[PDB]
């Protein structure tokens, strides 16, 4: 496999400190071995929840007490639980383009899902208003996949909407929030909300490995009450995994990791854009590269997206199409993730793109 | 600080080879690091599924491919998924006494659950006939908590019932199946399943640790088709955990540990029963002491079950009554779980019990 990954779903393992993670695991195991034979508090070990709460209040400005947070074997399990905590009759609203997987999860749940188009400011509040939903699912920090950062003004608009009527909720998926390059950090929607209409959700898939399977959500106390009233849920994250995370955070290894990785990803995104402009001369349009670990490139060709993809897979370039993120064509648009893209493989990689874009 | 536990819920941390597990973890990691930035296959990494499939076909006669198996961070998320694969209008049935947690999950989902009492051969097929459910939840190998082992005749009656009408299924929870001591083990129900009515669910929580969170389920092809039709699921079980378990199995460490713990518990259960018959003069009756990590004792008293339990909290002896396992009285019976009972605490424990019942 002499592959090159322009994939957004992967993360580069060479710069994760796996020995540090493993040493954090051993520290946690020896500090807490006696209590490992317990099954965690269903919301997650309290001290781990406390570590995450301090962490996210620091980095993102999130305001919560650890009692509000639930862990977490992935955002998909948390989101399922969340649909059971929300009113059963709620009408959901997701960004178009967006996460088809959650769209299918919601439809499969018999829910009504309205797809909300985007504009230069993020998910379209005008379409939200026209279609009149109950629950919004949004990616304000770095829209997925379009990469649009939602400006504060649009955030204000969404919060005003949520607050003008009862039992309206905003699910803020703060995927990709650890990295914000030549823009500065904008605080989360939750931190701008005065009325607790926001379910903040975050994950460690990108700040760590995806195979580690940990995410978390912060409930409004009304939904938290609805949670506690269940009485039968069990934690899906292994206790050691929770404790290794808590050590990794509290040792300062996580902040060290993130700082170094931000510098690394900033430089790699500059290099990739420069290679893209050299190879494609300015016949590629790049969009949504302000933050996060991916951007969009639209090209222009008489090749269908599907045949471009079929031909990039032959050159062993791993890359995906924007058409994948339709929930519910006109030009080729592609998603370029530079998480796993090796820094020595840029030119070669971009070359494999030109030949897959064109044929030469 | 001087507690003695006759709990089933307990799990040996002391005689769990955590160093062997950690060495299997690092071996798996050096061999498979570059795939830890990848997301697992949603059913689970194929090779972990194959390792488990070979294991369970050996130890329990289970007939399946890895293609049919789903993992699995605990048996409850597998259960929830399962209720989604099964017809939305299914009527469930659970043993009484049984697992109140699942009863609670099923009811909180809006499902009608029937409770089905036991007779000498296990789940009462006469009551299943009478109350007319669609889906059975059963523990044929060692009924929880009664210790009753369902004989082949009753298994065939259950299979026949499921064969006679559409949309009838049997969930076989092989929760306690790693330890069956001085009775030659019966094969799983699943091994008798000619018409593919049985969903087999097993777990490693009992056989390694509860906090480790790894369980699995074997789906009949129609249900597997139902699952692949979803197309949105993601593996909840940490890829690291999956790989560590595959190394643990294939290095032969799992089989070593199980042979050792099996022998340990055989000898401990025999010693415990010896001590019981010595101290209680034949005014104790022991039921289902053949396998698993528990059995049932019935005594003589004036005291409410709450009285024996209450007086045992004052001898610092943790124990459970059969009325705990109603899915919602007329005498006391208790369940003795020798899982984390220390071998030096047997005689003392039984001594405490004789006073806990009486107070002489």
Curated annotation (Swiss-Prot), chains A, B:
Alphabetical keyword list: Activator, Aminotransferase, DNA-binding, Pyridoxal phosphate, Repressor, Transcription, Transcription regulation, Transferase
Cofactor(s) essential for the protein: pyridoxal 5'-phosphate
GO BP of this protein: biosynthetic process
Keyword Amino-acid biosynthesis: no
Residue ranges of the TM segments: none
Residue numbers carrying N6-(pyridoxal phosphate)lysine: 206
Keyword Transferase among UniProt keywords: yes
GO molecular function: DNA binding; DNA-binding transcription factor activity; pyridoxal phosphate binding; transaminase activity
UniProt family annotation: In the C-terminal section; belongs to the class-I pyridoxal-phosphate-dependent aminotransferase family.
Function as written in the Swiss-Prot or TrEMBL entry: Activates the transcription of the gabTD operon. Is also a repressor of its own expression, both in the presence and absence of GABA. Binds specifically to the DNA region overlapping the -35 region of the gabT promoter and the -10 and +1 regions of the gabR promoter. Principally regulates the utilization of gamma-aminobutyrate.
Designated name of the protein: HTH-type transcriptional regulatory protein GabR
Organism: Bacillus subtilis (strain 168)
First-to-last residue of the parent protein present: 107 to 471 of 479
């Amino acid at each position: 496999s002499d592959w090159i990954s322009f994939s957004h779903m992967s993360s580069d393992t060479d710069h994760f400190p796996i020995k540090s993670w493993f040493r954090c695991e051993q520290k946690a195991a020896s500090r807490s071995y006696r209590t490992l034979g317990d099954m965690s508090h269903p919301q997650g070990i309290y001290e781990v929840r406390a570590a995450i709460t301090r962490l996210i209040s620091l980095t993102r400005g999130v305001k919560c007490r650890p009692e509000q947070m639930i862990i977490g074997a992935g955002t998909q399990v948390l989101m399922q639980l969340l649909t059971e905590l929300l009113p059963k009759e709620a009408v959901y609203a997701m960004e178009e383009p967006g996460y088809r997987r959650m769209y299918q999860l919601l439809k499969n749940a018999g829910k009504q899902v309205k797809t909300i188009m985007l504009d230069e400011k993020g998910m379209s509040i005008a379409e939200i208003t026209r279609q009149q939903p109950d629950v919004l699912v949004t990616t304000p920090s770095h829209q997925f996949p379009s990469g649009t950062i939602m400006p504060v003004s649009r955030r204000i608009q969404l919060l005003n909407w949520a607050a003008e009527e009862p039992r309206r909720y905003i699910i803020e998926d703060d995927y990709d929030s650890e990295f914000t390059y030549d823009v500065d950090s904008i605080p989360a929607l939750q931190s701008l909300d005065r009325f607790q209409n926001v379910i903040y959700m975050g994950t460690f898939s990108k700040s760590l490995l995806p195979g580690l399977r940990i995410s978390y959500m912060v409930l409004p106390p009304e939904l938290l009450r609805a949670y506690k009233q269940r009485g039968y849920d069990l934690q899906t994250c292994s206790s050691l995994t929770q404790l290794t995370l808590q050590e990794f955070i509290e040792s300062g290894e996580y902040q060290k990791h993130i700082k170094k990785m931000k510098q690394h990803y900033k430089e790699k995104r500059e290099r990739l854009i420069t290679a893209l402009e050299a190879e494609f001369s300015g016949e590629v349009t790049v969009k949504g590269a302000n933050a996060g670990l991916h951007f969009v490139t639209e090209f222009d060709t008489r090749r269908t997206e599907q045949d471009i993809l079929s031909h990039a897979a032959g050159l062993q370039l791993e890359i995906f199409g924007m058409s994948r993120f339709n929930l519910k064509t006109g030009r080729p648009a592609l998603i370029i993730g530079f998480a796993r893209l090796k820094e020595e493989d840029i030119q070669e990689g971009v070359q494999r793109l030109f030949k897959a874009v064109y044929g030469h």
